[PDB]
């Protein structure tokens, strides 16, 4: 709610119990606790639509890692109604995808970007360096939304505009 600047990609109202999403422009930071820390996309991104996320804050003490994927249902139908974790709950369900990232790419000041092709293949990359198809099974018929859980080696995350970086 509040603010504006329609166009760019930002965080959706729906967020974990202990998730404070608010910044001068757009950023998602944790409030407290450990569990309950799921987040979705503010607007429906397209297949080729590339997404970027700069790791603002990182946690180096807890155990586990983060998760990133796509979904079918709308993020508005999940607001104030999310599970305790991002899986198997947020995954086994019909039309839900999620994957984990390596520890080598779990640092601060790192730009985590990832997209999907017409072959339902999701490819990610760090520091403008793709890694390949990490997630699959993504449909390309109807709208789609992204998903990201911050619980482990990450605290704050700021979504960037791929339009500013990418060009091709």
From Swiss-Prot:
Instruction: List residues of the NHR domain.
Output: 8-162
Which compartments is it annotated to reside in? Nucleus
What is the role of the protein in this entry?
Answer: Involved in neurogenesis. Interacts with other neurogenic proteins in the specification of the neuroblast versus epidermoblast cell fate.
Q: Which gene encodes it?
A: neur
Q: What's this protein's name?
A: Protein neuralized
Q: Which domain of life is it from?
A: Eukaryota
């Amino acid at each position: 709610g509040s603010s504006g600047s329609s166009g760019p990609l930002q965080f959706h109202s729906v967020h974990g119990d202990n998730i404070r999403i608010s910044r001068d422009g757009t950023l998602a930071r944790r409030f407290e606790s450990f569990c309950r820390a799921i987040t979705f996309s503010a607007r429906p991104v397209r297949i080729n639509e590339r997404i970027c996320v700069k790791f603002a804050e990182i946690s180096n003490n807890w155990n586990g890692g983060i998760r990133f994927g796509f979904t079918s249902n709308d993020p508005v139908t999940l607001e104030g109604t999310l599970p305790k974790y991002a899986c198997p709950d947020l995954t086994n369900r019909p039309g839900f995808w999620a994957k984990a990232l390596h520890e080598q790419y779990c640092e601060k000041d790192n730009i985590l970007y990832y997209y999907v092709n017409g072959a339902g293949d999701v490819i990610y990359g760090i520091n403008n360096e793709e890694k390949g198809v990490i997630l699959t099974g993504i449909d390309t018929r109807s709208l789609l939304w992204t998903v990201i859980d911050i619980y482990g080696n990450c605290t704050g995350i700021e979504f960037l505009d791929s339009r500013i970086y990418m060009y091709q």
